[PDB]
Amino acid sequence: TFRYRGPSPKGDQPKAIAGLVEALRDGERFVTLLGATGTGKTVTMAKVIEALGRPALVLAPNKILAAQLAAEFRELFPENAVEYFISYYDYYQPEAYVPGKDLYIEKDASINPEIERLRHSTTRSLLTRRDVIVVASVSAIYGLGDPREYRARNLVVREVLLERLLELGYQRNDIDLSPGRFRAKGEVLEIFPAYETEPIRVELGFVLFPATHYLSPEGLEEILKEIEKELWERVRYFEERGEVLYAQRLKERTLYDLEMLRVMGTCPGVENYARYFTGKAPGEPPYTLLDYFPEDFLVFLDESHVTVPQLQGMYRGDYARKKTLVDYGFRLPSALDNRPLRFEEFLERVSQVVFVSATPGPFELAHSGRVVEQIIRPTGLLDPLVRVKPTENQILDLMEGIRERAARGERTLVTVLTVRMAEELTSFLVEHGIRARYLHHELDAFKRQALIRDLRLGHYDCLVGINLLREGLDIPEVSLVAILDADKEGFLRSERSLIQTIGRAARNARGEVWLYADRVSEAMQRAIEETNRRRALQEAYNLEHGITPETV
């Protein structure tokens, strides 16, 4: 049972909630929430979750949005369990090998304790409460230990109770303490649970869950035997090919791990032997976070037009990177079984799915048994006016438009199609009195968000880039979005992409989008019509309720 404490639903949220709830209660497996930018999709998801009272998983297209959603849900359900199943492949380097330059890359060690802490807090809550909402990036869905063992291996709250501490994955280190380590300096225990930020001093209640998701198994001895059996078979494979270097590499690394496991029941990169620990057969789908949820959990795929394709391509992407480590003797073929799920395998592990997007993709449109939209924004803000302007004298027209807006405190976003164009336009604008910066495609997150942050803070007035479908670009001061080569083919000029880009001007009471082109492509035509449809519906709602837009 959840306890919603956020703002009451306004605009189209009430209608969206209900209908969405009605569809789910009627047993629809696939449902889509078609919600324009700024209509408050998080609150809608939250009320649906509250109404159904089932634990939920919300997947986002990237780590920035994932973190953002987690933070919002925590504020909306201050008394329930909101988890962020962050993944190590989000901020750190995984093991890898690039044939191109024969360079092998080790995964980062001694990572920030917050990573594993958040992950353990997630599995712990899922096995102790129903009022749980888990947010995660799609990439987070990867092989994980067997949930049965993780579950059946707990410690309820003497002296034998320090034989348990270890068969749960906890390690000794009286020196410095770490989450998932114990300190026994005499008659006094100090367990630091893998999911806590505050250790537990024991002298003279709670429930301790394992410190690892791949904790030791049944015939540990017998398991190391099966792994070594695969090792020599694979060594022979290389030997017969004359690839002595690969045979040597695989032998040394595998024997090192086997020895490590025989002396600590664990070893760095233990996940690679996942299948041996879960007893899964080769090729079979591994256990994942999904298996830790109750059978009736609800799934939300935020930005579904992006997240669905991500879920569809995860397996292939991972296979390519892993297959390389296998081909050159760094890992056993069995490491391939510690992988992401194929899309169909994912669908086999979920019951009901709610797709969320302002521009739902083909999968959601062909499969949803119900599409519920929310167009009216709680704020009453209108979708922008969209104009089509000639390419003749585009830059001069744009420049005067930008300077006019900067004069009165308004910002401009500009999208071009090539790097040369982005480079030249930016320098040209700067040389003509405009505070413009270039959002280079090589910029990573936070750095990309740092630049965007400066625009939000008003350090400059115009941001030029190729792909503007980035996070954090919904700024109230942006009143103009200019799209050069608006009629050219390509992903960034598709119907959906145009609609998404147009939305960057919907947080300003005077928002406008200028499409520079000498012809109207079908994508433009459709995007213009949809923006007009939304604007008209919201103007009608505002008229009826006596609301007049204002920027804020």
Ligand X SMILES: CCCCCCCCO[C@@H]1O[C@H](CO)[C@@H](O)[C@H](O)[C@H]1O
Q: Which amino acid is at 526?
A: R
* Non-local CB neighbours of 59 within 8 Å, separated by 6+ positions: 135, 136, 137, 138, 140, 141, 299, 300, 301, 302, 307, 311
Name 414's bridge partners: 464, 482
Q: CA-based diameter of the chain, in Å?
A: 84
Of the candidate residues 53, 78, 317, 409, the single one contacting ligand X (CB under 6 A): 409
Q: Is 167 in the site for ligand X (CB under 6 A)?
A: no
| Residues between 441 and 500 with contacts to ligand X, criterion CB under 6 A | 458
Output 356 or 502, the one with its CB closest to ligand X: 502
Instruction: Tell me the site size for ligand X, rule CB under 6 A.
Output: 13
Q: What is the dihedral of CA 224, 226, 229, 233, to 10 degrees?
A: -120
* H or E stretch covering 103: strand 103-105
* H or E stretch covering 14: helix 13-16
Output 186 or 242, the one with its CB closest to ligand X: 242
Crossing angle for the helix pair 220-241 and 244-264, nearest 10 degrees? 170
Q: Nearest 5°: phi and psi at 136? A: -165, 160
The distance of closest approach from Cβ of residue 386 to ligand X in the complex, given in angstroms and rounded to an integer, is 8
Q: What is the DSSP track for 203-226?
A: ----EE--S-SS---SSHHHHHHH
The distance of closest approach from Cβ of residue 536 to ligand X in the complex, given in angstroms and rounded to an integer, is 6
Output 3 or 459, the one with its CB closest to ligand X: 459
Residue list for the binding site for ATP: 35-42
Cβ(295)–Cβ(204) under 8 Å?
no
Q: Which stretch binds ligand X (CB under 6 A): 36-44, 110-118, 231-239, 443-451?
A: 231-239
Local structure of residue 101 (DSSP, 8 states): G
Q: Is 27 in the site for ligand X (CB under 6 A)?
A: no
The distance of closest approach from Cβ of residue 364 to ligand X in the complex, given in angstroms and rounded to an integer, is 25
Q: Is 46 in the site for ligand X (CB under 6 A)?
A: no
In the three-class reduction of DSSP (H, G, I as helix; E, B as strand; rest coil), residue 436 is classed as strand
Q: Which stretch binds ligand X (CB under 6 A): 47-55, 182-190, 236-244, 423-431?
A: 236-244
Output 419 or 543, the one with its CB closest to ligand X: 543
Q: Is 407 in the site for ligand X (CB under 6 A)?
A: yes
Tokens representing 416 are 């071009």
Distance CA 440, CA 417 (A): 12
CA angle 45, 36, 389 (to 5 degrees): 165
Q: Is 185 in the site for ligand X (CB under 6 A)?
A: no
Of the candidate residues 242, 548, 550, 552, the single one contacting ligand X (CB under 6 A): 242
The distance of closest approach from Cβ of residue 507 to ligand X in the complex, given in angstroms and rounded to an integer, is 14
| Residues between 515 and 544 with contacts to ligand X, criterion CB under 6 A | 528-529, 532
The distance of closest approach from Cβ of residue 513 to ligand X in the complex, given in angstroms and rounded to an integer, is 12
Name the residue with tokens 């991972």: 318
Crossing angle for the helix pair 63-76 and 41-52, nearest 10 degrees? 60
Output 109 or 407, the one with its CB closest to ligand X: 407
Residue with CB nearest ligand X? 409
Tokens representing 24 are 């789910």
CA 320 to chain centroid = 21
Residue list for the binding site: 35-42
Output 178 or 248, the one with its CB closest to ligand X: 248
Q: What is the dihedral of CA 153, 157, 159, 161, to 10 degrees?
A: 20
Of the candidate residues 101, 408, 420, 550, the single one contacting ligand X (CB under 6 A): 408
Q: How many Cβ atoms sit within 10 Å of the Cβ of residue 148?
A: 11
The distance of closest approach from Cβ of residue 237 to ligand X in the complex, given in angstroms and rounded to an integer, is 9
Of the candidate residues 187, 240, 392, 522, the single one contacting ligand X (CB under 6 A): 240
Q: Residue 46, by phi and psi: left (phi above 0), alpha (psi -120 to 50) or beta?
A: alpha
The distance of closest approach from Cβ of residue 241 to ligand X in the complex, given in angstroms and rounded to an integer, is 8
Q: Is 235 in the site for ligand X (CB under 6 A)?
A: yes
Q: Is 236 in the site for ligand X (CB under 6 A)?
A: yes
Binding pattern for the stretch 351-390 against ligand X, x by CB under 6 A and - elsewhere: ----------------------------------------
Of the candidate residues 15, 164, 183, 232, the single one contacting ligand X (CB under 6 A): 232
Q: Which stretch binds ligand X (CB under 6 A): 18-26, 180-188, 233-241, 292-300?
A: 233-241
Q: Is 239 in the site for ligand X (CB under 6 A)?
A: yes
Q: Residues interacting with ligand X, by CB under 6 A?
A: 232, 235-236, 239-240, 242, 407-409, 458, 528-529, 532
